[PDB]
Short mmCIF file of N, CA and C and ligand atoms in Angstrom, two decimals:
data_model
loop_
_atom_site.label_atom_id
_atom_site.label_comp_id
_atom_site.label_asym_id
_atom_site.label_seq_id
_atom_site.Cartn_x
_atom_site.Cartn_y
_atom_site.Cartn_z
N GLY A 16 75.47 54.84 30.76
CA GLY A 16 76.75 54.64 30.76
C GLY A 16 77.43 55.94 31.33
N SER A 17 78.27 55.79 30.60
CA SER A 17 79.48 57.12 30.46
C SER A 17 79.49 58.17 29.84
N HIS A 18 79.68 59.63 29.95
CA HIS A 18 79.95 60.46 28.89
C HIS A 18 81.29 60.83 28.89
N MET A 19 82.68 60.37 29.45
CA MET A 19 83.30 60.39 29.37
C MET A 19 84.80 59.11 28.73
N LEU A 20 85.46 59.28 28.19
CA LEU A 20 85.80 58.12 26.74
C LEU A 20 86.71 57.08 27.88
N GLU A 21 86.56 55.66 27.70
CA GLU A 21 86.62 54.47 27.80
C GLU A 21 88.09 54.49 28.55
N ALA A 22 88.93 55.05 27.36
CA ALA A 22 89.93 55.26 27.08
C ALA A 22 90.61 56.23 26.58
N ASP A 23 92.12 56.55 27.06
CA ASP A 23 92.44 58.30 26.45
C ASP A 23 93.98 57.32 25.07
N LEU A 24 93.83 57.25 24.21
CA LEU A 24 94.47 56.72 22.86
C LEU A 24 94.71 58.23 22.05
N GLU A 25 95.76 58.17 22.56
CA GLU A 25 96.57 59.93 21.96
C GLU A 25 97.74 59.25 20.46
N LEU A 26 97.39 59.89 19.87
CA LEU A 26 98.18 59.82 17.85
C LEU A 26 99.78 61.15 18.96
N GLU A 27 100.42 60.12 18.25
CA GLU A 27 101.95 61.27 18.15
C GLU A 27 102.61 60.76 16.84
N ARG A 28 103.11 61.84 16.26
CA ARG A 28 103.68 62.35 14.99
C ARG A 28 104.82 61.67 15.26
N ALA A 29 105.70 61.01 14.27
CA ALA A 29 106.97 59.95 14.91
C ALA A 29 107.31 60.62 12.83
N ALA A 30 107.17 60.40 12.04
CA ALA A 30 107.68 60.26 10.97
C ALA A 30 107.14 60.69 9.53
N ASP A 31 107.80 61.38 8.71
CA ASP A 31 107.22 61.62 6.93
C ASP A 31 107.28 60.71 6.79
N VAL A 32 105.81 60.06 5.76
CA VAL A 32 105.62 58.69 5.33
C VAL A 32 106.70 59.58 3.28
N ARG A 33 107.54 58.99 3.37
CA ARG A 33 108.55 58.75 2.24
C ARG A 33 109.77 57.33 2.07
N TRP A 34 109.75 57.35 0.73
CA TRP A 34 110.66 56.30 0.70
C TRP A 34 112.23 56.98 1.05
N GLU A 35 113.04 55.95 1.73
CA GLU A 35 113.75 55.93 2.59
C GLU A 35 115.33 55.55 1.49
N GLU A 36 116.26 56.91 0.66
CA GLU A 36 117.25 56.34 -0.23
C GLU A 36 118.04 55.25 1.09
N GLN A 37 118.70 55.87 2.08
CA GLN A 37 119.64 55.27 3.09
C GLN A 37 119.30 54.20 2.85
N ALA A 38 118.26 53.48 2.91
CA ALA A 38 117.95 52.07 3.35
C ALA A 38 117.46 50.53 2.08
N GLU A 39 117.30 51.56 0.76
CA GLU A 39 117.80 51.54 -0.13
C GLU A 39 118.69 51.05 -0.94
N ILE A 40 120.27 52.21 -0.15
CA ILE A 40 121.57 51.29 -0.50
C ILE A 40 122.07 49.91 0.86
N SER A 41 121.85 50.39 2.08
CA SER A 41 122.24 49.14 2.91
C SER A 41 120.78 48.30 3.84
N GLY A 42 119.79 48.57 2.82
CA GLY A 42 118.91 47.51 3.40
C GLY A 42 117.84 47.93 4.99
N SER A 43 118.57 48.97 5.77
CA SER A 43 117.77 49.41 7.23
C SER A 43 118.42 50.25 6.80
N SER A 44 118.08 51.48 7.60
CA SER A 44 118.48 52.61 7.99
C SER A 44 117.40 53.30 8.84
N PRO A 45 118.22 53.76 10.44
CA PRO A 45 117.89 54.96 11.02
C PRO A 45 117.04 56.36 10.07
N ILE A 46 115.55 56.62 10.78
CA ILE A 46 115.07 57.61 10.21
C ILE A 46 114.83 58.52 11.07
N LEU A 47 116.01 59.72 10.60
CA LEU A 47 116.37 60.80 11.72
C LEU A 47 115.02 61.20 11.76
N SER A 48 114.95 61.78 13.24
CA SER A 48 114.07 61.65 13.89
C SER A 48 114.19 63.77 14.43
N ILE A 49 113.21 63.98 15.22
CA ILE A 49 113.79 65.64 15.81
C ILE A 49 112.28 65.84 17.03
N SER A 50 114.69 69.93 17.68
CA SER A 50 116.74 68.82 18.19
C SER A 50 115.97 67.96 18.45
N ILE A 51 117.95 66.78 17.66
CA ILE A 51 117.24 65.10 16.90
C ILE A 51 117.31 64.35 18.31
N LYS A 52 116.89 63.84 17.60
CA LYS A 52 115.62 63.44 19.04
C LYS A 52 116.39 61.44 18.97
N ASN A 53 117.69 61.04 20.50
CA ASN A 53 118.32 59.98 20.00
C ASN A 53 117.56 58.80 20.87
N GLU A 54 116.50 59.30 21.32
CA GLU A 54 115.98 58.02 21.95
C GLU A 54 114.44 57.92 22.31
N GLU A 55 114.05 56.86 22.20
CA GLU A 55 112.25 57.14 22.16
C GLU A 55 111.63 56.44 23.21
N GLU A 56 111.37 57.34 24.81
CA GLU A 56 110.79 57.28 25.54
C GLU A 56 109.25 56.49 25.24
N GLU A 57 108.79 55.24 25.76
CA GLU A 57 107.37 55.21 25.48
C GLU A 57 106.68 55.46 26.81
N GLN A 58 106.96 55.92 27.85
CA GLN A 58 105.48 56.46 28.92
C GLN A 58 105.57 57.91 27.84
N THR A 59 105.61 58.39 27.42
CA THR A 59 106.20 59.95 27.18
C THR A 59 104.98 59.98 26.28
N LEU A 60 104.69 60.97 25.71
CA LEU A 60 104.04 61.53 24.78
C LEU A 60 104.73 62.27 23.86
N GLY A 61 104.96 61.70 22.95
CA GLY A 61 106.29 63.05 22.94
C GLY A 61 107.63 63.02 23.68
N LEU B 25 95.96 68.47 12.44
CA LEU B 25 96.83 66.30 12.20
C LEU B 25 97.82 66.15 10.80
N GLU B 26 98.91 67.18 10.91
CA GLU B 26 99.17 66.48 9.64
C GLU B 26 99.69 65.05 8.58
N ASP B 27 100.10 65.18 7.64
CA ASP B 27 100.26 63.92 6.84
C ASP B 27 101.86 63.68 7.50
N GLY B 28 101.33 62.82 7.89
CA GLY B 28 102.77 61.85 9.01
C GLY B 28 101.96 60.41 8.88
N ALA B 29 103.52 59.70 9.66
CA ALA B 29 102.97 58.29 10.27
C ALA B 29 103.50 58.98 12.25
N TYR B 30 102.34 58.18 13.10
CA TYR B 30 101.73 58.22 14.38
C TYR B 30 102.30 56.88 15.08
N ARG B 31 102.89 56.60 15.60
CA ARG B 31 102.24 56.12 17.20
C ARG B 31 100.69 56.64 18.19
N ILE B 32 100.37 55.13 18.47
CA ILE B 32 98.93 54.73 18.89
C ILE B 32 99.34 54.62 20.73
N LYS B 33 99.19 55.80 21.06
CA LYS B 33 99.73 55.13 22.52
C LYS B 33 98.47 54.96 23.12
N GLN B 34 98.11 54.34 24.17
CA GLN B 34 97.20 54.56 25.30
C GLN B 34 97.98 55.14 27.29
N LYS B 35 96.94 55.73 27.14
CA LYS B 35 97.05 56.36 28.36
C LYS B 35 97.52 54.88 29.92
N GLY B 36 97.79 55.16 31.27
CA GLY B 36 97.73 54.39 32.37
C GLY B 36 97.91 54.76 33.44
N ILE B 37 97.84 53.82 34.66
CA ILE B 37 98.51 54.62 35.50
C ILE B 37 100.50 54.69 35.34
N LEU B 38 100.74 53.73 34.86
CA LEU B 38 102.78 54.01 34.64
C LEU B 38 102.90 55.15 33.48
N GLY B 39 102.25 55.52 33.70
CA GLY B 39 102.51 56.29 31.88
C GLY B 39 101.98 55.38 30.34
N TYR B 40 102.30 55.87 29.31
CA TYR B 40 101.81 55.38 28.20
C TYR B 40 102.20 54.35 27.66
N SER B 41 101.99 53.26 26.93
CA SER B 41 102.05 51.80 26.31
C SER B 41 102.21 52.17 24.30
N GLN B 42 102.46 51.86 23.96
CA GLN B 42 101.97 52.22 22.39
C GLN B 42 101.89 51.05 22.56
N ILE B 43 100.63 50.97 21.41
CA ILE B 43 99.15 49.76 21.18
C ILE B 43 99.59 50.04 19.34
N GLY B 44 100.35 50.35 18.90
CA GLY B 44 99.92 50.40 17.40
C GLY B 44 101.20 51.71 16.89
N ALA B 45 100.09 52.10 15.79
CA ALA B 45 100.79 52.82 14.58
C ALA B 45 100.14 53.62 13.59
N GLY B 46 99.91 54.59 12.64
CA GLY B 46 98.57 54.40 11.22
C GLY B 46 99.68 55.74 10.68
N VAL B 47 98.64 56.23 9.64
CA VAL B 47 98.44 57.33 8.75
C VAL B 47 97.88 58.38 8.43
N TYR B 48 98.18 59.42 8.70
CA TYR B 48 97.24 60.80 8.66
C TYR B 48 97.38 60.84 7.06
N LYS B 49 96.97 61.05 5.98
CA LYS B 49 96.51 61.23 4.70
C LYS B 49 95.59 61.50 4.71
N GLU B 50 95.62 63.26 3.79
CA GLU B 50 94.53 63.85 3.39
C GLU B 50 92.96 63.70 3.97
N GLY B 51 93.26 64.49 5.62
CA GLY B 51 92.69 65.04 6.27
C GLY B 51 92.19 63.08 7.15
N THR B 52 92.57 62.14 6.85
CA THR B 52 92.08 60.24 7.10
C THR B 52 93.29 60.21 7.59
N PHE B 53 93.40 59.14 8.89
CA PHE B 53 93.91 58.32 10.63
C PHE B 53 93.58 57.07 9.55
N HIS B 54 94.67 56.50 8.97
CA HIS B 54 94.64 55.05 8.87
C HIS B 54 94.78 54.13 9.86
N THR B 55 94.84 52.87 10.57
CA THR B 55 95.26 52.30 11.78
C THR B 55 94.85 50.76 11.18
N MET B 56 94.47 49.79 11.95
CA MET B 56 94.88 48.44 12.16
C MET B 56 92.85 48.12 13.00
N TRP B 57 92.32 47.71 12.55
CA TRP B 57 91.06 48.02 12.76
C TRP B 57 91.42 46.62 15.05
N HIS B 58 92.44 45.37 14.51
CA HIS B 58 92.67 45.44 15.80
C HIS B 58 93.24 46.12 17.13
N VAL B 59 93.97 47.16 16.32
CA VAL B 59 94.38 48.15 17.61
C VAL B 59 93.75 49.16 17.97
N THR B 60 92.67 49.20 17.44
CA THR B 60 91.88 50.39 18.34
C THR B 60 90.51 50.11 18.77
N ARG B 61 90.20 49.01 17.66
CA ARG B 61 88.46 48.78 17.78
C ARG B 61 87.83 49.57 17.62
N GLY B 62 87.63 50.41 16.73
CA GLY B 62 86.87 51.67 16.90
C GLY B 62 86.38 52.71 17.79
N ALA B 63 87.72 52.42 18.50
CA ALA B 63 87.79 53.58 20.28
C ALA B 63 87.81 54.93 19.16
N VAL B 64 86.86 56.19 19.97
CA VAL B 64 88.27 57.06 19.80
C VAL B 64 89.14 57.82 19.70
N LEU B 65 90.23 58.28 18.99
CA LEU B 65 91.56 58.43 19.27
C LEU B 65 91.36 60.46 18.83
N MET B 66 92.27 60.67 20.49
CA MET B 66 92.49 62.61 20.27
C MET B 66 94.07 62.61 19.99
N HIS B 67 94.18 63.25 19.21
CA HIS B 67 95.45 64.19 19.22
C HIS B 67 95.46 65.95 19.67
N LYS B 68 96.55 65.72 20.45
CA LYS B 68 96.80 67.34 21.00
C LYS B 68 95.23 68.42 21.18
N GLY B 69 94.44 67.24 21.88
CA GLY B 69 93.36 67.79 22.89
C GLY B 69 92.81 67.60 21.20
N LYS B 70 91.97 67.05 19.77
CA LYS B 70 91.52 67.06 19.39
C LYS B 70 90.97 65.80 18.73
N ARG B 71 89.69 65.10 19.26
CA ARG B 71 88.77 64.15 19.09
C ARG B 71 89.02 63.49 17.64
N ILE B 72 89.17 62.27 17.14
CA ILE B 72 88.91 61.95 15.72
C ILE B 72 88.00 60.78 15.95
N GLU B 73 87.13 60.70 14.79
CA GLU B 73 85.73 59.37 15.44
C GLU B 73 86.49 58.09 14.44
N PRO B 74 86.05 57.34 14.61
CA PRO B 74 85.76 56.14 12.92
C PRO B 74 84.91 56.94 12.32
N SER B 75 85.87 56.25 10.49
CA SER B 75 84.57 56.61 9.82
C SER B 75 84.09 55.04 8.62
N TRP B 76 85.38 54.29 8.86
CA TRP B 76 84.92 53.35 8.31
C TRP B 76 85.86 52.24 8.38
N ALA B 77 85.69 50.92 8.45
CA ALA B 77 86.02 50.02 9.16
C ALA B 77 85.60 48.62 7.94
N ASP B 78 86.44 48.20 7.83
CA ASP B 78 86.67 46.32 7.03
C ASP B 78 87.74 45.07 8.10
N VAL B 79 86.60 44.61 8.76
CA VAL B 79 87.01 43.49 10.09
C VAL B 79 88.13 42.81 9.74
N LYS B 80 87.49 42.40 8.55
CA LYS B 80 88.72 40.88 6.98
C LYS B 80 89.63 41.23 6.94
N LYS B 81 89.93 42.72 6.43
CA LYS B 81 91.04 43.33 6.32
C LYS B 81 92.70 43.54 7.40
N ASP B 82 91.55 44.25 8.39
CA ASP B 82 91.98 44.58 9.88
C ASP B 82 92.57 46.21 9.41
N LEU B 83 91.41 47.18 9.12
CA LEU B 83 91.20 47.66 8.85
C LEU B 83 90.64 48.61 8.88
N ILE B 84 91.76 49.90 9.58
CA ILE B 84 90.21 51.08 10.49
C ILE B 84 90.06 52.62 10.03
N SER B 85 89.40 53.52 9.11
CA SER B 85 90.61 54.89 8.08
C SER B 85 89.02 55.50 9.40
N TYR B 86 89.39 56.59 10.47
CA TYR B 86 89.23 57.86 11.23
C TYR B 86 88.99 59.47 10.79
N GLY B 87 87.93 59.88 10.35
CA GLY B 87 87.95 61.52 9.77
C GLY B 87 88.23 61.25 7.80
N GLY B 88 87.53 60.27 7.35
CA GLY B 88 87.81 59.72 6.07
C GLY B 88 87.40 58.11 5.66
N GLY B 89 86.59 58.17 4.61
CA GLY B 89 87.55 56.65 3.48
C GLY B 89 88.95 56.88 3.28
N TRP B 90 89.40 55.54 2.74
CA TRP B 90 90.37 55.09 2.61
C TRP B 90 90.86 56.42 1.97
N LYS B 91 92.32 56.57 1.65
CA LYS B 91 92.84 57.50 0.87
C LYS B 91 94.69 56.76 1.26
N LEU B 92 95.14 55.84 1.53
CA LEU B 92 96.09 54.61 0.95
C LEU B 92 95.87 54.51 -0.25
N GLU B 93 96.90 54.16 -1.59
CA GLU B 93 96.56 54.22 -2.68
C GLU B 93 97.50 53.75 -3.59
N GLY B 94 98.69 52.96 -2.86
CA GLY B 94 100.08 51.99 -3.01
C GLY B 94 99.27 50.65 -3.33
N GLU B 95 99.85 50.33 -4.52
CA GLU B 95 99.95 49.12 -5.44
C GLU B 95 100.92 48.18 -5.22
N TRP B 96 100.99 47.59 -4.10
CA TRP B 96 102.37 46.50 -4.83
C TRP B 96 101.84 45.61 -5.86
N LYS B 97 102.98 45.78 -6.31
CA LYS B 97 102.67 44.21 -7.74
C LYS B 97 104.08 43.59 -8.24
N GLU B 98 104.38 42.34 -7.48
CA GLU B 98 105.11 40.90 -7.88
C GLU B 98 106.75 41.25 -8.09
N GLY B 99 108.01 41.30 -6.98
CA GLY B 99 108.94 41.09 -7.46
C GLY B 99 109.53 42.76 -6.90
N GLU B 100 108.62 44.30 -6.94
CA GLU B 100 108.96 45.16 -6.29
C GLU B 100 108.80 44.94 -4.67
N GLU B 101 110.64 45.56 -4.14
CA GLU B 101 110.83 45.93 -3.19
C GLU B 101 110.04 46.68 -2.33
N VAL B 102 109.47 46.79 -1.22
CA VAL B 102 108.89 47.97 -0.59
C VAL B 102 110.06 48.41 1.34
N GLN B 103 109.60 49.61 1.77
CA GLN B 103 109.90 49.92 2.70
C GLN B 103 108.79 49.83 3.89
N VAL B 104 109.05 49.45 5.15
CA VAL B 104 108.48 49.73 6.42
C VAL B 104 108.92 50.03 7.05
N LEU B 105 108.45 51.05 7.48
CA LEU B 105 108.34 52.94 7.58
C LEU B 105 108.10 52.32 8.95
N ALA B 106 109.12 51.47 10.16
CA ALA B 106 108.38 50.65 11.51
C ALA B 106 108.66 52.05 12.35
N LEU B 107 106.97 52.03 13.03
CA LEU B 107 108.14 52.88 14.60
C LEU B 107 107.13 51.60 15.54
N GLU B 108 108.07 51.18 16.29
CA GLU B 108 107.73 49.83 16.96
C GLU B 108 108.43 50.48 18.66
N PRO B 109 107.51 50.68 19.66
CA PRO B 109 107.44 50.52 20.96
C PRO B 109 109.29 50.46 21.12
N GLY B 110 109.50 52.22 22.19
CA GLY B 110 110.22 51.88 22.32
C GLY B 110 112.11 52.46 21.39
N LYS B 111 111.71 52.72 20.12
CA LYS B 111 112.36 52.31 19.17
C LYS B 111 112.40 53.54 17.83
N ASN B 112 112.84 54.81 18.05
CA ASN B 112 113.17 55.48 16.74
C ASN B 112 112.77 54.45 15.59
N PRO B 113 111.93 55.37 14.47
CA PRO B 113 111.56 55.22 13.31
C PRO B 113 112.94 54.55 12.66
N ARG B 114 112.51 53.63 11.80
CA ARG B 114 113.54 52.95 11.17
C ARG B 114 113.16 52.03 9.57
N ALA B 115 113.20 52.73 8.39
CA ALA B 115 112.47 51.94 7.14
C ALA B 115 114.36 50.63 7.11
N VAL B 116 113.00 49.73 6.60
CA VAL B 116 113.24 48.15 6.95
C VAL B 116 113.23 48.65 5.05
N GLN B 117 113.92 47.87 3.99
CA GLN B 117 113.35 47.60 2.82
C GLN B 117 113.56 45.66 2.63
N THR B 118 112.29 45.36 1.71
CA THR B 118 111.77 43.99 2.25
C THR B 118 111.71 43.80 1.11
N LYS B 119 111.36 42.82 0.48
CA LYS B 119 110.61 41.65 -1.20
C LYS B 119 109.36 41.35 -0.85
N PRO B 120 108.52 41.57 -0.44
CA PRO B 120 107.19 40.65 -0.22
C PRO B 120 107.30 39.45 -1.05
N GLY B 121 106.72 38.46 -0.13
CA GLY B 121 105.58 37.07 -1.47
C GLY B 121 104.26 37.01 -1.97
N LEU B 122 104.30 36.51 -2.59
CA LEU B 122 102.42 35.89 -2.69
C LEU B 122 102.81 34.46 -1.90
N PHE B 123 101.88 34.54 -0.92
CA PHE B 123 101.74 32.99 -0.44
C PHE B 123 99.83 32.74 -0.79
N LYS B 124 99.95 31.33 -0.66
CA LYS B 124 98.11 30.54 -0.85
C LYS B 124 97.50 30.59 0.53
N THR B 125 96.39 30.95 0.89
CA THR B 125 95.51 30.57 1.45
C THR B 125 94.28 29.87 1.46
N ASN B 126 93.57 30.32 2.60
CA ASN B 126 92.21 29.85 1.99
C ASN B 126 91.46 30.36 0.76
N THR B 127 91.32 31.68 1.52
CA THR B 127 90.41 33.04 1.08
C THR B 127 90.77 33.12 -0.90
N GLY B 128 92.14 32.96 -1.03
CA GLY B 128 93.04 32.95 -2.34
C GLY B 128 94.87 32.79 -1.68
N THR B 129 94.80 33.85 -3.43
CA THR B 129 96.44 34.56 -2.79
C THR B 129 97.02 36.08 -2.05
N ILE B 130 98.06 35.94 -1.37
CA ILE B 130 98.05 37.36 -0.89
C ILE B 130 99.28 37.36 -1.10
N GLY B 131 99.69 39.54 -1.04
CA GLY B 131 100.98 39.41 -1.34
C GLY B 131 101.41 40.06 0.12
N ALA B 132 102.43 39.34 1.36
CA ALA B 132 102.42 39.69 2.47
C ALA B 132 104.02 39.94 3.06
N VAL B 133 104.63 40.05 4.07
CA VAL B 133 105.93 40.68 4.38
C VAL B 133 105.64 39.31 5.35
N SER B 134 107.13 39.96 6.30
CA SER B 134 107.04 38.49 7.36
C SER B 134 107.01 40.15 8.62
N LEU B 135 106.50 38.44 9.13
CA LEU B 135 106.64 39.27 10.55
C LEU B 135 107.70 39.44 11.99
N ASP B 136 108.47 40.74 11.33
CA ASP B 136 109.94 41.55 12.39
C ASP B 136 109.69 42.46 12.60
N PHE B 137 108.91 42.37 13.25
CA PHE B 137 108.97 43.26 13.98
C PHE B 137 107.91 43.12 15.32
N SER B 138 107.92 44.68 16.03
CA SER B 138 106.73 44.55 17.37
C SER B 138 105.30 43.77 16.82
N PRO B 139 105.23 43.61 17.43
CA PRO B 139 103.15 43.66 17.41
C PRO B 139 102.78 44.86 18.21
N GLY B 140 103.54 45.78 18.57
CA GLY B 140 103.29 47.13 18.74
C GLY B 140 103.57 48.13 17.53
N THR B 141 104.12 47.36 16.52
CA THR B 141 104.50 48.44 14.81
C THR B 141 103.15 48.35 14.38
N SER B 142 102.40 47.27 14.94
CA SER B 142 100.90 47.61 13.45
C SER B 142 100.40 48.72 12.80
N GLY B 143 99.72 48.29 11.41
CA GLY B 143 99.55 50.29 11.88
C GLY B 143 100.93 51.51 11.04
N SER B 144 102.35 50.63 11.12
CA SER B 144 103.41 51.10 10.63
C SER B 144 103.05 51.31 8.97
N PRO B 145 103.29 52.00 8.41
CA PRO B 145 102.99 52.37 6.40
C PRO B 145 103.80 51.35 6.67
N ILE B 146 104.30 50.50 4.98
CA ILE B 146 104.53 50.06 3.95
C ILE B 146 104.82 50.92 2.56
N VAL B 147 106.14 50.89 2.23
CA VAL B 147 105.86 52.33 1.19
C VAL B 147 106.13 51.22 0.16
N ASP B 148 106.12 52.28 -1.18
CA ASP B 148 106.91 51.81 -1.97
C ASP B 148 107.59 52.64 -3.03
N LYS B 149 107.83 52.67 -4.00
CA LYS B 149 109.12 53.20 -3.59
C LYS B 149 108.43 54.89 -4.55
N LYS B 150 107.55 55.64 -4.69
CA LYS B 150 107.32 56.65 -5.48
C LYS B 150 106.70 56.88 -4.03
N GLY B 151 106.88 56.09 -2.26
CA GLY B 151 106.64 57.31 -1.62
C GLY B 151 105.12 56.57 -1.12
N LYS B 152 104.62 56.56 -1.42
CA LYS B 152 103.24 55.88 -1.61
C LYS B 152 102.82 54.60 -0.40
N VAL B 153 101.17 54.11 0.19
CA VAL B 153 101.78 53.14 1.14
C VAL B 153 101.12 52.07 0.62
N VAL B 154 101.41 50.69 0.57
CA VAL B 154 100.63 49.96 -0.01
C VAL B 154 100.06 49.11 0.50
N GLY B 155 100.74 49.16 1.96
CA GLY B 155 99.41 48.20 2.76
C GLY B 155 100.42 48.86 4.82
N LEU B 156 99.90 48.26 4.77
CA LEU B 156 99.75 48.83 6.31
C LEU B 156 100.31 47.49 7.17
N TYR B 157 101.61 47.45 8.90
CA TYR B 157 101.90 46.33 9.21
C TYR B 157 100.90 45.79 10.22
N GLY B 158 100.99 44.67 10.17
CA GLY B 158 100.57 44.07 11.55
C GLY B 158 99.10 43.37 11.60
N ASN B 159 98.69 42.81 9.99
CA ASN B 159 97.09 42.44 9.87
C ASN B 159 98.38 40.77 9.35
N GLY B 160 97.49 39.58 11.01
CA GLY B 160 98.23 39.15 10.57
C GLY B 160 97.36 37.88 9.88
N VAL B 161 97.96 36.52 8.56
CA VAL B 161 96.97 36.38 8.44
C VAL B 161 97.80 34.76 7.88
N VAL B 162 97.03 33.92 8.38
CA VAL B 162 97.80 32.14 8.13
C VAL B 162 97.45 32.15 7.33
N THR B 163 98.47 31.04 6.43
CA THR B 163 99.39 30.43 4.59
C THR B 163 98.48 29.03 5.39
N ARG B 164 98.78 28.27 4.36
CA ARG B 164 98.04 27.49 3.75
C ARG B 164 99.31 26.30 4.13
N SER B 165 100.07 26.44 4.26
CA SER B 165 101.50 26.69 5.00
C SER B 165 101.95 26.66 6.16
N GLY B 166 100.66 27.11 7.00
CA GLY B 166 100.71 27.26 8.64
C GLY B 166 101.62 28.25 9.24
N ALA B 167 101.76 29.44 8.33
CA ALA B 167 102.48 30.18 8.96
C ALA B 167 101.71 31.86 9.15
N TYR B 168 102.44 31.91 10.14
CA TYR B 168 101.60 33.54 10.31
C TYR B 168 102.59 34.65 8.71
N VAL B 169 102.21 35.40 8.46
CA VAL B 169 102.62 36.41 8.04
C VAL B 169 102.00 37.55 7.98
N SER B 170 102.62 39.50 7.41
CA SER B 170 101.91 40.23 7.76
C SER B 170 100.55 40.00 5.93
N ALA B 171 100.04 40.54 6.01
CA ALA B 171 99.09 40.92 4.13
C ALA B 171 99.13 41.60 4.44
N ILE B 172 99.65 42.11 2.72
CA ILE B 172 99.31 43.59 2.02
C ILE B 172 98.78 43.66 1.27
N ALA B 173 98.38 42.59 0.53
CA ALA B 173 97.55 42.90 -0.88
C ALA B 173 96.92 41.57 -1.58
N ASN B 174 95.48 41.66 -2.00
CA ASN B 174 95.28 41.00 -2.59
C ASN B 174 95.10 40.15 -3.76
CL1 CL C 243 99.14 55.76 -0.11
#
């Protein structure tokens, strides 16, 4: 076989695991993410 | 790796695609079997290997046994901390339901996010993870739901 990995699966940290108070108030809330990140670009790792 | 919720991205020639998500807790990364199928994961040049899986529950952990400790109880609301492809994280509060299946009766939330959200944590008011999004199961009524509890 090959000693190289079949697929490059990478992890990228995105959020703290916690209950979000704003979502309890309104039903839904964006989780402020970080500088403040205004948009997720899927194609780039971080 | 620090504790938290992560995206899982697969490289190809056009760049990364988000195939799912998971949770790092107490040294262990938790995600869905259907997402990685046991494949090795990388984080910032560090490899992590599969340690345990339950294909029937659609669960797999890397670098240790299952650490998630939340237990949902009927009537209680939870939050899906959704990491969808192309979107910043969003908390969505919802009340899971009980559904009948051939195997028994389960607690489940509606499949209201991208399939690429699979692995995102569903948390209780204590901030504990009661399950992960994206374990699609068929109910007796012929609905697909996202199972969290037996
Ligand atoms: Cl937990």
